[PDB]
Write a protein that binds this DNA or RNA. Structure first.
Ligand code: MG
Ligand code: MG
Ligand code: MG
Ligand code: MG
Ligand code: MG
Ligand code: MG
Ligand code: MG
Ligand code: MG
Ligand code: MG
Ligand code: MG
Ligand code: MG
Ligand code: MG
Ligand code: MG
Ligand code: MG
Ligand code: MG
Ligand code: MG
Ligand code: MG
Ligand code: MG
Ligand code: MG
Ligand code: MG
Ligand code: MG
Ligand code: MG
Ligand code: MG
Ligand code: MG
Ligand code: MG
Ligand code: MG
Ligand code: MG
Ligand code: MG
Ligand code: MG
Ligand code: MG
Ligand code: MG
Ligand code: MG
Ligand code: MG
Ligand code: ZN
Lengths: 43, 53, 122, 110
RNA sequence: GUUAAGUUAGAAAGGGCGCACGGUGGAUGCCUUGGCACUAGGAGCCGAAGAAGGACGGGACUAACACCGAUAUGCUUUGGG
RNA sequence: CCGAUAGUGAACCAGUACCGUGAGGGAAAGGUGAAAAGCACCCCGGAAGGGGAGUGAAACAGUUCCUGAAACCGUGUGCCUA
RNA sequence: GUAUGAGUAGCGAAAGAAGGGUGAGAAUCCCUUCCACCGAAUAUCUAAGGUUUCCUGAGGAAGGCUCGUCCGCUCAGGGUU
RNA sequence: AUGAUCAGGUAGAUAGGUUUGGAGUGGAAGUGUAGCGAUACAUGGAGCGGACAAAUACUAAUCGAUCGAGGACUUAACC
């Protein structure tokens, strides 16, 4: 059984990291939404 | 496979009539006067048949 | 005879180990069913030792375990359980026809409630 | 006239302790200790310590004759329950109750 | 006294109903530290002189909160007490 | 207008714990006493836990501690029952 | 929140035995001997991934499908050149 | 299955051991002889031999303890 989650530090950073969110208007929209909700962890 | 009705208290108490346990077969030691099982060595003095074990 | 919870070869190994233990230490503690089997095993071994010749010794060597009882200064040389059986235990009962062991009941074991007993060669 | 002892929140299920406490009720204390010693259950040591504690504080606090006591009443009550889980097949989990009990014994003369 | 025919009590391995005394459990009552809807007034922007929001640090002892920034649980001055 | 299943999701270290690759979803959890005066000392026990003694108006207020319903689990007994 | 099913199903592939020790307590912890199992692995390195699980001294409420004096668990100190 | 049933507990053959047997298998070990050797022959229906038979108190059935009646009334026959 190969399951769906196969971790990788680099892949996680490159798909979901802070600098990837900051590179598009919709990513910065995601960051603004998470700041408005008050979450401790953004990206 | 599955209980059709729940069991009442009286029925459960009736079924539990025989789920008690018995009382040990013990008597007093002729040497030290303590309690012990028949046909067993006495754990308080280590005697059996009037001899040291 | 009793199956003691285990297959043929495992039962044979358990019997050989327990018989050698009783020869070496002369008093062991175990469960009741094992004691009631090694009774037979050990007394047949002692009879073979009482007989005394080379055929009997070679028959006892096919069952006894190759263990060291003690080292004796005579150049220090060890003594083995077969040597003790043929040289020490067997002459002890040269005038007794049967019944070289006895069983003494002790009581239940804490872990599983098994009835434990003492068996000694006397 | 009487003395008592309690053990509270003992990690043992009440049914398994009641089955043993039943056969000590109304007996002379020495006979009761002997009975508890030769019953091969896991509840016997706990009840033995509770009963000996009751005999001891009868002797000390109330100056009663420790050779003429009987077990007046003994009982088991429910304590709080620890809630646990066990993983079953198909991805589901089932409940587990780790139950506790309060054990009370009273001794007196005649 | 025996025999025959007949009648009627009592019993609890366990259970039921009533009562007494406990355990568990957290309803209810009382309470409020937090909320909800408004009124009068004020104010309606911050940032390259580096923002909003963060990371890591600073204590005799320091895991967390609060405060502070290598001058770090704080420095100068003017008033109050 | 609410009074702890109510009122904000959040009266308590809450957008936290936890779930999800992610966007995202999203809890439970208030009350000793006026005052810690929070039980010196003795006894059983390895401890936990008790029984005294003491504090307090109260300990059947003993660090999930105001009150403490029902389900549910027990011990004793007046009447009935093979 | 608490029952019934019920002291019922289950306790997740496998060889253990005895003698010493420790301890309040031992089938289950330590030591010795004998026996058994793997051996193109059930041995030795090392990427990924995890992130202190590593070592020493204490501990036994909870976790460990039993027990536990033990532990990848709890506490305090260390450890990566 | 467990309860139960049956045979016994020193007034003892209930089980094990021991000693004699039996079925079964087929000719032990050691030694010697023949052969260069594999091997064959003798000692010798040998040795071994779960559960089957008979003797034998050698080992264990030690020592304790618990339960269990004193027998309702009426009538009729005898007595
Ligand atoms: Mg856009
Ligand atoms: Mg049998
Ligand atoms: Mg046994
Ligand atoms: Mg009655
Ligand atoms: Mg009866
Ligand atoms: Mg009764
Ligand atoms: Mg009833
Ligand atoms: Mg009724
Ligand atoms: Mg009722
Ligand atoms: Mg009632
Ligand atoms: Mg309560
Ligand atoms: Mg309720
Ligand atoms: Mg306003
Ligand atoms: Mg600290
Ligand atoms: Mg500076
Ligand atoms: Mg309330
Ligand atoms: Mg208060
Ligand atoms: Mg107050
Ligand atoms: Mg002690
Ligand atoms: Mg205490
Ligand atoms: Mg009250
Ligand atoms: Mg009160
Ligand atoms: Mg109550
Ligand atoms: Mg109630
Ligand atoms: Mg009644
Ligand atoms: Mg349930
Ligand atoms: Mg061992
Ligand atoms: Mg850790
Ligand atoms: Mg556990
Ligand atoms: Mg389990
Ligand atoms: Mg210890
Ligand atoms: Mg550790
Ligand atoms: Mg023959
Ligand atoms: Zn004795």
């Amino acid at each position: 059984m190969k399951r769906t989650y196969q971790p990788s530090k680099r892949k996680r950073k490159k798909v979901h990291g802070f600098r990837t969110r900051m590179s598009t208007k919709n990513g910065r929209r995601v960051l603004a939404s998470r700041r408005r909700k008050g979450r401790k962890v953004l990206s | 496979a599955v209980p059709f009705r729940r069991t009442s208290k009286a029925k459960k108490r009736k079924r539990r009539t025989h789920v008690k346990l018995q009382l040990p077969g013990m008597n007093e030691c002729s040497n030290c006067g303590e309690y012990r099982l028949s046909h067993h060595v006495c754990p308080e003095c280590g005697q059996y048949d009037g001899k040291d074990v | 005879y009793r199956k003691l919870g285990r297959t043929s070869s495992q039962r044979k190994a358990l019997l050989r180990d327990l018989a050698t233990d009783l020869i070496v230490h002369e008093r062991i503690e175990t469960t009741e069913a094992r004691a009631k089997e090694i009774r037979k095993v050990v007394e047949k071994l002692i009879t073979s030792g009482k007989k005394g010749d080379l055929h009997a010794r070679r028959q006892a060597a096919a069952f006894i375990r190759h263990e060291v009882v003690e080292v004796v200064q005579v150049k220090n040389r060890p003594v083995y359980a077969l040597q003790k059986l043929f040289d020490d235990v067997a002459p002890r009962y040269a005038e007794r026809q049967g019944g070289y062991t006895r069983i003494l009941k002790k009581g239940p074991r804490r872990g599983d409630g098994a009835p434990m007993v003492i068996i000694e060669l006397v | 006239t009487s003395a008592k002892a309690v053990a509270k929140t003992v990690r043992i299920a009440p049914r398994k302790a009641r089955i043993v406490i039943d056969l000590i009720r109304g007996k002379q204390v020495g006979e009761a200790i002997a009975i508890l010693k030769y019953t091969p259950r896991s509840a016997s040591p706990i009840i033995e310590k509770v009963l000996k504690s009751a005999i001891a504080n009868a002797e000390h606090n109330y100056d009663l004759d420790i050779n003429n006591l009987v077990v007046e009443e003994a009982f088991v009550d429910e304590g709080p329950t620890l809630k646990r889980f066990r993983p079953r097949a198909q991805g589901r989990a089932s409940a587990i109750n780790k139950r506790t009990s309060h054990i009370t014994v009273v001794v007196s003369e005649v």
